[model samples]
Target chain A: GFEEALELTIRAKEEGDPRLLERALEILERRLKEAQERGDLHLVLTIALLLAAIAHRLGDPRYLEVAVRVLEEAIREALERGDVQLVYNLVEVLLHVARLLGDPRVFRFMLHILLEAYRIARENGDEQILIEIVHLFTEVIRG
Target chain B: GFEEALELTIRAKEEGDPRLLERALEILERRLKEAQERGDLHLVLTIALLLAAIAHRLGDPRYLEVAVRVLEEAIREALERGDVQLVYNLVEVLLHVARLLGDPRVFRFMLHILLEAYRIARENGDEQILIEIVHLFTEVIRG
Candidate 1:
């Protein structure tokens, strides 16, 4: 439902309809709170990524800040669990968000978080994930 | 005299001679202080790398710690000045020292510092440095 609401939010934005966007935002915000309270970080992360996408779409820094906060919290949990798959997903999402924001602090934070994910991936000996992370680093480093 | 002392330090270790090792250490330490007081970070970094090499040769963690401190300070200055060449040198030196120390904290620190250096390199549009850093990241991420 979070993602479904998010899709509608995107559609609302594309169609330039405030009524649908407001409805979608209301549902998504409610879903985010519910997911956070339930302590399902994976779900929270998914919702936050969608919200971040919405933030990017709307070009709203304050909204972006809220989404980033949620992301950091969920990411901390994912890293603690050594959940490499979720970490990768969250990291990629955050990296994109960071670039969108273009804040050096956020960009540096993303790098540090990515390094932690890399550490977990190496510990698990997941060559594919490691390779994927290296590619991201290469892109950022060469930018 | 810096490289000369470093060579003697290595030779001392190979020959199992404490006298030669002590002589090299004393000279290197003195040179490090002189370089620091002169505000010549490049010289400080070079001496620190030699000292780090000596520390690894002697299998002394404390010596490695001191060398890392100097390297970090020098590297900070290098990054501040956007001295990409020296930053690369210092980063490579610290990376090797981090591996030698095999401490997770130090290893992670090296990774963050490397990313910052990458940022500076990218800003300067230096292809060679960017390529070298990506190779280093690939090695660390894979390991």
Candidate 2:
């Protein structure tokens, strides 16, 4: 079953046809909705990320929205579980998505997420994170 | 004594006389250095604040730089003495200094400081500070 699902998506995308692309997007979206309804955050994030990766090719808003929301949710989870690198990765990805959209509101959405990260870095007095945070701030300024 | 000190500075600037302005600046600078050397952080901060306030009147950068340094030192002292409010106020002064200078470098110097502050506000779960920090971030973006 896994091999078949993978082959379908890969072969559909490889066909380089809009008709074929739609089929896989449809399948991915269906699975994403199912995963979300099942309350499976991991699966939701995986699907969301997958949808986000092909954003240019697919050009869908809901997928990117779902991606940001899933990233935000993952940010909180990584923070709560004390997953340092995961948190960094999530936040960085969040910013990257915001950058791609070129939307101030996109960055605004993640402002609180970064605020959450800011606290952990502060409580621990981690200057390295502080520097990286400043780097992020500079990125925001670029917009 | 404090009131008269304030009066002389106002009068010096209000008079629009370079000679009187120079006299006040000299007095302020000497007191700032002396207070700093004597480890009177509060006094140093007071003089620095005065110098910063009078900066537009005299357009003296040294005064502003000294004032920012005094605030930075005062901020560290307040942090050590467990004066949380004072630390915020001191750092707020530091930001105000950057605002006055309108220099990217000056902001960068304090960019790390805000990251640390962001961490604290994040950890405390204060959404108010969270908003304020984002507002601050937006201001940074506006640059």
Candidate 3:
């Protein structure tokens, strides 16, 4: 079932079919809503991450704006649950947005968010995430 | 002698030796001054061309400013003598300054000078200079 969904989405995107892409997104959104309603917060967040990645790859400004909002909400939820991996994933999404927009403001905001994430990671003794965040900030600042 | 002078100048630049380059320039300036004093207008113009070329390569803003003044004086003399070729050359120098400076005031000055040069060239039946002036004006306007 997972393979079928992946193949369908990939085929639709490769064919430049917006309708298929929309349908795939609608299905994912519905699934996320059902997960949220059932209090399956982890599943909802996982689906949100997947959707955000897809939206980012589409390279549409409208999709990117929506992705930013979704990712921001997911980041807050992740922080509340103390889910370090979720925050790390959200950092990837923010980095993607910075690259896509080429807006200095977005990059600065991402850096601020990342620094908060780094502080949490350090407090929790998650050295790996702290290292990753430091690396990401260095790369972004160099750019 | 001209070839030797050019070679020595190139060697000085390649070696990153400012003193040699300065000496070469001093020699050129002294020759130009002597030509001007003797009223050898053609030799003075040839030296001016060489100096302008070197200044352009160096990209020294102060040197460029001096080159502009030199060219402007040349332009005034050409106008008095009805020398259309020199007028066209002077306009070329003005256009170069406008582009390098990217200042609106320079552009306005270039446009005004070019318009007057165009009128004079046309009246003198210097069709080639007129065409060149038109081309120069178009470039400045587009920029």
Candidate 4:
């Protein structure tokens, strides 16, 4: 019960089966809610990254309305923690969410994220994020 | 007929609607099959790349098992004609198929592919594909 969801989270990526991947996201979603309700910021952060698998950060039935909101919450928490490696992980989640959402709303969030990342990179001397930003944006600009 | 399917495919990515994306892939698959039967290598090659928008190279269900084999036939034809771009395109299809199969069969093919890619890159003085080979292989080694 404890790590069941954790295992599912990993399985989602390892399985490569869409059905199994969906199942994994379902488990992760439920786990994330529980973690959030209890203010389990640590677990919440972890689950948000996991969620990026399918939910990362698009979709038919699986692209739940809750996806972006959940990620936003986790992003806020991660940024607060100020753990560079962990915060960088959230950057990936944001980029995927932007691609999947593809709406002005998501674009705004991505813009916010890029701006935030630029600051973090400049202040922390981790300009690598800038490269990623361009790579992702390049694909977005092309056909 | 083409105009309608064309629109659906565009809508799939532009709208970031999973259902729309899947619908478009289905339509494209059907069209590609018919086009292939008519010995239309040109249309076949074009649609194989189009398939990527929906398939997007992940998950079991979305992976689209039929996609690889479909692309391979066209690849054979393309390579024979020494069409570098088309051949490069097939490298992507092969890499996706390798991950999708998650089996050694795709391995044998990928192994052949990697060496061939290296040769092509060396001969053509093209670093682009070598970079791709490394990126794809990095994922292969990780998990």
First chain TM-score for all predictions: 0.79, 0.66, 0.69, 0.56
Worst 10 residues of 3 chain A by lDDT: A134-143
Residues B96-141 of candidate 1: C-alpha lDDT, one tens digit per residue: 7777877666655655666666667767788667646544543342
How would you class the docking of model 2?
incorrect
Query: Looking at candidate 3, what is the lDDT of residue B26?
Result: 60
Error of 1 at B45 (Å): 3.2
Scored by TM against the true chain B, the candidates give 0.79, 0.69, 0.73, 0.54
Separately for all candidates shown, the number of backbone clashes (residues 3 or more apart, or on different chains) is: 0, 2, 0, 4
Against the reference, the lDDT scores of all candidates come to: 0.69, 0.60, 0.61, 0.57
What is the Å distance of residue A14 in model 4 from its true position? 16
List the lowest-lDDT window of 10 residues for candidate 1 chain B: B134-143
**Candidate 2 at residue B18, lDDT?**
59
C-alpha displacement of B133 in model 4, angstroms?
19
Task: Give lDDT tens digits, candidate 2, residues B2-111.
Answer: 45457777787667665655666677877777777567766765677777777656787776777777777776676566544455556556777767766666555454
Q: Pick by lDDT: which candidate is best?
A: 1
Q: List the residue pairs that clash in candidate 4.
A: A16-B60, A18-B60, A57-A96, A57-A97
Q: For candidate 3, lDDT tens digit of each residue in B1-143?
A: 12333434455545667565456556656675676666555555555554544544455455445545665666677767777676676666566555554556667766877788888887878887788889888988976
lDDT by residue (tens digit), candidate 4, A1-143: 22343334334444555565567567778887998787666555455544553453124434434656776676667667655445455555555544555555755665565556556767877667667655555543432
* Lowest lDDT 10-residue stretch of candidate 2 chain A: A1-10
| Residue pairs clashing, model 1 | none
Could you report the DockQ of all the candidates, in the order they appear? 0.01, 0.01, 0.01, 0.03
